[PDB]
Amino acid sequence: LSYFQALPLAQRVSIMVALPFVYTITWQLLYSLRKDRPPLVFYWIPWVGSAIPYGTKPYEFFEDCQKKYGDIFSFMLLGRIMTVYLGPKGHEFIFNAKLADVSAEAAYSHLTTPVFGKGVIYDCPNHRLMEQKKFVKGALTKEAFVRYVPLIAEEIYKYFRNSKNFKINENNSGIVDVMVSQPEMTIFTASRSLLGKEMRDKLDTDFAYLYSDLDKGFTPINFVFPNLPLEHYRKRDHAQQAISGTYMSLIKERREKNDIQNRDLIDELMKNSTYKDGTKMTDQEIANLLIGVLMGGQHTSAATSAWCLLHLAERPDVQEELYQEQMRVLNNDTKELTYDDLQNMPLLNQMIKETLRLHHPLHSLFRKVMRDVAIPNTSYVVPRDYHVLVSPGYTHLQEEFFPKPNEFNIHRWDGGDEVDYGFGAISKGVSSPYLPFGGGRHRCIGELFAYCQLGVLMSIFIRTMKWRYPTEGETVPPSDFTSMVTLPTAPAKIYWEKRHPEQKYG
Ligand SMILES: CC[C@@H](C)n1ncn(-c2ccc(N3CCN(c4ccc(OC[C@H]5CO[C@](Cn6cncn6)(c6ccc(Cl)cc6Cl)O5)cc4)CC3)cc2)c1=O
Ligand code: HEM
Ligand SMILES: [Cl-]
Ligand SMILES: [Cl-]
């Protein structure tokens, strides 16, 4: 190092920028000597790790890692080490892990707690979240869906009429960007049914911008830096307070009038948000919980109906097959749609089921390791402070589980023990290769709402329109895996025409 100082400046600079790369390469060579750790995927760039391949093609990244290291491998991701366990055995290891070994709230809270607010979901012990899930299910019964279906349909028909994306009472055909239309239709239908009429109407005012601001705070870049003094972090914090304050205001007005019925999720939480220990949720916490429930249905559902429309755009045979089922179940379109009719549209539901296979909206689910965990039938130990990463969406796309996994075939769906974590009996095992809604204690409680919402929506699209791509030979767009959910690359335009030009919608 006395030789170093004699070198020309450009060399001394080269050596000094090279030093971090040599140090991390050296540290990875020393790391591979531990046989009690999963293989660490090799990476060139200090700290960044494998962010680029993982962030842009996670399933292809996983597949190449699998061929080289097996089902269990670690990778460096923006200063954090993620341990992946691919396949059914991984579903079981992670989704069914013990509370003492891994924590979802420790992995997610710095991202969700500023968006939803304090005291609920991931800003509370797990046993409280189990009971919050039980409360919310009180508004997700069959009887609730019976009520929701005509409200969701009414919202969709208003949208067809009023939205500049359609204006369907004046145009017989059009081009629409499903990445514009579907997020909007999703928030209108979920508002009207879960928050009710008062809150749905506020979306016709400038209040709607607050939801947009709240959404902007909900990006994966908040996983790494949950708080910067940035403008859009400020707008997010304002929105959470303005929105939750508005829900509390509505909650209070209802309590004064005793206007507490069986209409929406606000009614349900006002009547049934008392924990087993006799304590109960505050209005601020009810409002924060409402924010989280709506947000959990927003991106997953909008992404999914966008993919349905796109896969059907290139399949007029499937559109026609679904249209035939619609005419059988709804008596040639003389019966108003009801929840029982959706339960009798098997092909419609297989179409949603198949879209969710091809496009799981959440490609990666995470838990933080809370104490060293041995991995059964390996020599690996995953140490405290790593993260484990489970990816059912990877298994959806695997030839071993689904022959010709990239083909959209709704007829592949032609056709154990239970455990109660506190929100109802669910499947005890999670070894299925197909888990669009997760499994174990953190499993989705919105699955039937999603089928209800998506089912009304696709039922009405099929009965009202035919559509295709605007250019011949165009196909399904590629996915963008960098956002909250995997969603199609925008814009994603389809050409539609009314099946009944004379029909007026409202
Ligand atoms: C620098 C290069 C660049 C290309 N790059 N480098 C890295 N990345 C990247 C990394 C990771 C990701 N991922 C990982 C995180 N992921 C994600 C994982 C889980 C998740 O949510 C799980 C929890 C929290 O939110 C919900 C979602 N939900 C559940 N049911 C329906 N939605 C949730 C649960 C309950 C409630 Cl009430 C609300 C919500 Cl939102 O569950 C959201 C996003 C998004 C993509 C994206 C990009 C990049 O883009
Ligand atoms: C097609 C639509 C949807 C899909 C694919 C989906 C998927 C998922 C998945 C994979 C999880 C587990 C997350 C994990 O294990 O880390 C989950 C959890 C959850 N989702 Fe959904 N979801 C959808 C719609 C909805 C809707 C409509 C709601 C509410 C109305 C909702 C609310 C929730 C809640 C409350 C949880 C519990 C989180 C926990 O217990 O930690 N989701 N969802
Ligand atoms: Cl009109
Ligand atoms: Cl459930």
Curated annotation (Swiss-Prot):
Keywords noted in UniProt: Heme, Iron, Lipid biosynthesis, Lipid metabolism, Membrane, Metal-binding, Monooxygenase, Oxidoreductase, Steroid biosynthesis, Steroid metabolism, Sterol biosynthesis, Sterol metabolism
Pathway: Steroid biosynthesis; zymosterol biosynthesis; zymosterol from lanosterol: step 1/6
Keyword Lipid metabolism: yes
Catalytic activity: a 14alpha-methyl steroid + 3 reduced [NADPH--hemoprotein reductase] + 3 O2 = a Delta(14) steroid + formate + 3 oxidized [NADPH--hemoprotein reductase] + 4 H2O + 4 H(+); a 14alpha-methyl steroid + reduced [NADPH--hemoprotein reductase] + O2 = a 14alpha-hydroxymethyl steroid + oxidized [NADPH--hemoprotein reductase] + H2O + H(+); a 14alpha-hydroxymethyl steroid + reduced [NADPH--hemoprotein reductase] + O2 = a 14alpha-formyl steroid + oxidized [NADPH--hemoprotein reductase] + 2 H2O + H(+); a 14alpha-formyl steroid + reduced [NADPH--hemoprotein reductase] + O2 = a Delta(14) steroid + formate + oxidized [NADPH--hemoprotein reductase] + H2O + 2 H(+)
One GO location term (cellular component): perinuclear endoplasmic reticulum
Binding of heme, residues: 444
Principal subcellular localisation of the protein: membrane
Entry annotated with the keyword Thylakoid: no
Cofactor dependency: heme
Domain of life: Eukaryota
Record-level Gene Ontology MF annotations: heme binding; iron ion binding; sterol 14-demethylase activity
Location within or outside the cell: Membrane
Alphabetized CDD domains for the sequence: CYP51-like
GO BP terms, alphabetized: ergosterol biosynthetic process
Annotated EC: 1.14.14.154
Biological role: Sterol 14alpha-demethylase that plays a critical role in the third module of ergosterol biosynthesis pathway, being ergosterol the major sterol component in fungal membranes that participates in a variety of functions. The third module or late pathway involves the ergosterol synthesis itself through consecutive reactions that mainly occur in the endoplasmic reticulum (ER) membrane. In filamentous fungi, during the initial step of this module, lanosterol (lanosta-8,24-dien-3beta-ol) can be metabolized to eburicol.
Family, similarity comment: Belongs to the cytochrome P450 family.
Protein name: Lanosterol 14-alpha demethylase
Annotated organism of origin: Candida glabrata (strain ATCC 2001 / BCRC 20586 / JCM 3761 / NBRC 0622 / NRRL Y-65 / CBS 138)
Gene field: ERG11
